[PDB]
Amino acid sequence: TSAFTLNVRLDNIAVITIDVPGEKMNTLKAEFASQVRAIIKQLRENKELRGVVFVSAKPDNFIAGADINMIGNCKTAQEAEALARQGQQLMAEIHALPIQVIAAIHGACLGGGLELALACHGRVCTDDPKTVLGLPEVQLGLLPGSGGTQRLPRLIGVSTALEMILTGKQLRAKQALKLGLVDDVVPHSILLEAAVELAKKERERILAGPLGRALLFKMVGKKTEHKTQGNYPATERILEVVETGLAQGTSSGYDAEARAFGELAMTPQSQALRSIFFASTDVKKDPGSDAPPAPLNSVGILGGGLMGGGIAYVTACKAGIPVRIKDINPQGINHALKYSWDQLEGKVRRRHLKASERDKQLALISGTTDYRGFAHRDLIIEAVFENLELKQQMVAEVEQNCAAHTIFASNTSSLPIGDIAAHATRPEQVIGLHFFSPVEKMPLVEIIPHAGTSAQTIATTVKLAKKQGKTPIVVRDKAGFYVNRILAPYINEAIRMLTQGERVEHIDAALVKFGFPVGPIQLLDEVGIDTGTKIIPVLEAAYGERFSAPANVVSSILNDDRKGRKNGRGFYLYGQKGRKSKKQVDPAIYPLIGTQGQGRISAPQVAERCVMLMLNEAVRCVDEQVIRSVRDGDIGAVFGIGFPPFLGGPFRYIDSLGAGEVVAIMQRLATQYGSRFTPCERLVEMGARGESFWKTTA
Template sequence: MTDSFKYEKDASNIVTVTMDMRGSVNAINDEFIEAMRSTLTKLQAEENLAGVVITSAKKTFIAGGDLNDLVAAQPGEEQGVFVRTEGIKALLRQIEKLPVPVVAAINGAALGGGLEVCLCCNHRIAVDSRAVLLGLPEVGLGLLPGGGGVVRLTSLLGFEKAFPFLIEGKKLGPAPALAAGLIHETVATQDELLPRAKAWILENPSSAVQAWDVKGFKIPGGGEENPAIRQGIVFAAAGLQKKTRGLLPAPEMILDIMVETLRVDLDTALRIESRQFAQLVTTPEAKNMINAFFFQMNQVAGGQSRPKGFEPNTVSRLGILGGGMMGQGIAMSAAMVGIDVVIKDVTMESAEKAKAYSEKGLAKLVQKGRMKEAAAAEVLARIKPSVSDSDLQGCDFIIEAVFENVELKHSLTKSTESCLAEGGVWASNTSTLPITALSTASSKPANFIGMHFFSPVDRMPLVEIICGAETSEETLAKAFDLTRQLKKTPIVVNDSPGFYTSRTISTPIQEAAQLMAEGVNAVRVESVGKSVGWPVGPLALQDEVSQKLSLDIIDAQISMGLRKTEDDPTPQGTALMRCLLNEHKRGGRVHGGGYYEYSESGKQIWPGLRDLYFKEDVDSAVSDQDIRDRLLFRPVIESLVCLETGVLRTVADGNIGSIMGIGAPTWTGGYIQFVNTYGLVRFVERCRELESKYGKRFAPPQIAIDKARLGELFQ
C-alpha cells in the first residue's frame, strides 16, 4: 500500500478507501495507478469482505486525468497511449468485478475520470452541495472520456439520454444528476455520507454485479435495431457535421463509440474506446484545445496578468453611464453578483428601459427554474435608474458605456469623475478608441482604464482590459478584480487603436470584402469562410457588426490621425463597403440589409453583389485554399503583430482573447497557437506565397521569422 489511499476496515468488514494523493487534488496519474493497484490487491485478498466505499479526503472527489501526460503524447506514440489506457481500464474493471458491493461516496466534483471511477461502482451517493458537480466534459478539451465513460454512460442511460453528457459535455449538480440517473441518492451533509454508504452495503449485500454484466442485459431505450435509435443516430451525425464542419474529431469519435456500444459487448466496446482515445490524444486539435482551454485559461483566469503586491479589491457600488445595449448588460452582470448599480442615462425613460432589460432576463431565469423569484427580485432591487450625477456619489467604479464619440466621452469624464470614491476607478467601455487619448479629459489619468465588454454582456465571458500610457498598476489590479468579481475572464492588453480584439476581428471581414471587390463570388467567399470554423461566415459577421459602424470607426480613426487612407491594406474592400452604404443604402442588418437580404423566411446573399462585382475569370483563378488561407491568415498575422508590438502582453491573452472574444475556431487553440501546430517554417513560407500573390498585408511578421529560425514555439 501507498500513503495515497487510506485503507480502513471496520467491524462490519466494510473497507473505506479514502483517496488522498499528493498535491491539492486527486488525479488519475502514475501515483493513482500504483495506489489503485495496491489497494485492489489487498481487497482481493480480504476474507469476509462485506463491501467497499471509495471516497476522497480532498475537496474534490477526483479532478480527472493528468493533462500534462496527455499533452505530452506525440504522433507515433498511439500504441503506448492505448496500452496505458487499457491498463487503467483494467483496474476500473477490477473494481466492478469485486465480489462485494462497491459504493462511490462523492464529496466533491467528480468530472471526467472522476465520474468514470464512480460509474464503476454499484451505487453512487453524493452530498447535496454546490461543491458537487458531475459530468464528462472532455469534449470541451478536444478529448473523449477514455476511462470507460462513453461506454458505461451509454450503457447506463441509453443513447439518447447519454448524448448531451458525452457530445456536449453537460455537467450537473447533485439534484439534477439524481434525476438524470447519474447517481442513486444524495445526503444532506458531509457527515451523513460515509454512514449512508455503509448502510447501503449492509442493506444490499448481494448487489455486487453491474447491470451490464448480467446475462441478457439490454441498453435502456434499445439498441441499433430500434428504428427510433437508428433515426437518432442519423440525425446526430448530420447535426454534428453541421455544427463542427468536420473540424473537431472528438465529437465524431464519441458518436462512433456510442454506436459501437449499441452493437458489441461491454469489454469490446471499452477496447474500441481505448483505440479511439489513443488516436485522438495525439491530434493537433486535441493539443490545441487542451493548451487553450486548460493550461492557458488557468494562466489568464488565475491572475498571470494581474500586478503583484496589491490586496484583492471588491466593488460594492458601480456607476454605469449609458443605458444602451452594453450598459444594460453590464448592469445585469454586476447586480447578479451582489453589486449595487446606478445606471445613468439622459432621460429616466432610457434609464428605466435599461433596468427593464435585467427584469426581462431575470424573468427568463425564473421561468427556466434557474433562479427563485425572491432571488430575482433581490437582484433587480440592486439596480437604480437615474438621470442625476449626484446618484453616482461614492461609487467605487464608474464604467462609461456610451457610443464611440470622443467628445461625448470626454464630457462625461469631466462632469462625473469627481463622483468616484477615494481611490475609485474610471473605466471606458470602448472597443476601438485609444485609452490614452480618452484619459486626457481625466484629472487622474492613473485611475483611468479601458474595459471592453462584449455583447451580449450577460452571456459573453470575456473582458479586454486596456492600459493607457498613465494607467497605474493598482488601477489595473482593481479592474482585473472587478472582472473576476463579475465572473468573467480578463485579458490585459496595451493601448492602440482597436486594441487587440477589435483590430483582429476586423481583418477577415475586410479580406472578405476585398475578395468580392476583386471579383470572387460572394456566395463562395461565405461558404469557404464557414469552412474555417467560425461561428458564422465573414459576410454574416460584417452584417451583424454593420458596414456603417465599421466605416464610422475607420473615418473616426482617420480624423484623429490614428490611421491614413493610403495605408488601408484592403482599399478595394473598403470602397465596396462605401459603395454599398452610400449608393445602395446597405449598411448592415440593423440598417435593413447589407451583404445579405433579410426576410421572415430567412436570409440570402444580396444578388446585387454578383451584378456589381463578380468576375468569372477572377473567381475561377482563385483556389478555395487561397480564399481559406487569406481569411484565416489575416487575423493570425494581426495577432502576431499585436504580440510583436507589445499590444498583447502574453501569448495566453492572445489565444484566450481570440477564442472567447472574437470567435477564433476552437480547433486552432487560438490564433497564435495555430502557428505552432501549422509549423513556424511552413507558416512563414505560406505567408510569403500569399504576399507575392495578394499583397504586403500577408508578409510574415518578424517575430514569426525569428521563432522559425530558432526552432521555437509561441508559449
C-alpha cells in the same frame, strides 16, 4: 505518503476518504493506481463487510478527473493507450466487487472522476451549485478512455449519453437525478449518512437494437459533422467507439475505446486543444500586476440599453457585486433594467433557482438618473456613446460625484485611453475595459491601461473582470487594441472578394469549414455593419492603407440604410418569414456593390486569403508589444473572434504551419493580390531563423 485511506465503522461498512495530500483538487494521478489496488485488496481480504462508500474530503470538489499532464508524458499511441487500458482494468475491479459500492459526490466530478462513479453500483450527490457531473475529455481533443464510453450509455441511454460525451456538458444535481445518473440528491450534511444507508442495501420505439439505434447514429453523426465540419478527430471516434461497443459487445468496444484514446492523444488537434486549456488556466491565474487589488464592494454603470444591461447583469449575478446604472434617459434605464430581469427570468426554464435567488441577485441591481448613490462607488464602468469629448466629461463627472479612489473603466472601441485620461484630476485611476456584445455570451474582455494607469487599478480591474466570468487580456493603448485590429483586415478581405465577383454563400461557408464559427460577413451582419465599420477609418490613419477597404462598398450599403440584422436587412435577408430555408443570403447586395469578376477563386484559397491577412496583423501586435505575451494573443483570438480552437490559436498555427512557409505564402499572395499581404516586418526575420513562437518546437 498516502492518498486514499479507508476506515470501517462499527457497522462493517468501509469508507474511503479521497484526499490528494497536497494538491488543491482531487485529480487521478498515476501514483493512485497502486494505492487503490492495495486498499481494494484489503476489502476482499477481510470478507467481513456489507458495503463501501467513496467520499472526497476536500470541500471544493469530488474528483476533477485525470490530470492533462499525464497524457503529455507519452510519446506514442501505445503509451497513451497503455494507461487508458489500465484505467478501464482498474475500475473493472471496482465494479467486480461482491460488496455493494457507492460513490458519495460533493463538488465537481468530471472526466475520469465521473467514470469512477459509473463503476460504483450506486451514486449519491449533493444539491450544491458547485457539484457538476460531466465527461469533458472531448473538449481536450480526447475521449473518456476509461470506461465512460460504455458504462454511461447503458445507464442513461445512448441518446442522452452521446450528448454528454460529444460536448462534455455538465449536469446539475436536480437535472442529474432525472437522467438516472445519480440515484439520489441529498444535502451535504445528510450525504455520507445517507450514502452508507443506501450502501448497506443489497422509449422503446427508438430502442430497436438494429434500426432504432441505427437511426440515432445516422442522425447524430450528420449533426455533429455539420457543427464541427469534420475538423475535430475525436468526434468521429466517439460515435465509432460507442456504436461498436453497444452493437458488438462491451468487451470488444472497451478495446476500441483504448485504441481511440491512444491515437487521439497524438493527434495534432488534441495537442492544440490541450495547450489553450493550459493557456486558459495560465490567464485565469495571472493578475496582470503585482500590486494588491483595491476593494470592489460596489460598482456603477454609465449608460443604458442592452449594452449597459449586459455589463450590470454579469456584474451582479455572476460576480455578486451590487451595481447601479446611471443614465439621463429614464427610458434608457428601463431597457438596461429589463434586460437584466429577462436574464434572471430564466427561472421559467427548469433552472435559475427561484424568486428567492432571482430577487436576491436582482436586489443588487438598481438604476437612477440623478447621481444620488454614487458617492462611494469603488469602480464605475463607462458605456456611453463613442465620443472623446463626451468620455472626458464622464471622467470629470465621476471624480466630482464619487469618491477620490474610484476607478474609471471605459468600454471604448476606437478611442485612445490617454486622450480619455488627458483632463483627469486623478489619471492613475482610469483604465480601458473592453467588452463585446452580446455581453452575456462573449467571454473575452480587453483591459487597456494608458500611460499613467496605476499598477494597482490594473490589478483591480482584472480581478473584477475575472469575477464576471471573463478571461481578460491586458493590451497596450494603441489604436484598435488587439482583437479588433486583427479582425478588420480579415473582414475587409472578405468584402474585397465580393467586389471581385464572389458569392457570399461561398465565402462564409469557406471560413466556417476552415474553423471559424461564422463567416466574416455573417459576423459583420450579426454584430452590425454600423459597428463593424466604424473602426476602419481609425485603423487607416493609425497604420496606413494596410487596413483599407474597397473604394465605396460600405459607403453604398448603409447609405441604403442596411445596418445589418439590427435593423431590417443587411448582407443577409432576415425577412424570410415561413422559414423553409434558414440561410437568408440577400441577393440585393450583389447589384448594390460593383462585382466584375465571376468566381475564379476556389474554396480554401478564400479562407486562406483573409486568415493570412489576419495572421500578419496578429504577429504585428506581439512585435509592437500590444499584447503582453504570445499566450495572451492565442487565447485573445481563440476566445475573441472564435479562431479555430483545433489549431490552438493564431500563433500555434504558425508554428505547425512553419514560420518559413507562411512567409513564402504571403510573399506569394503579395505578388498576386497586392502589397497588403507582404509578410510582417518581424515574420521575415522568423522565416530566416529557426524561430518558433512556443517552446518544444520540434
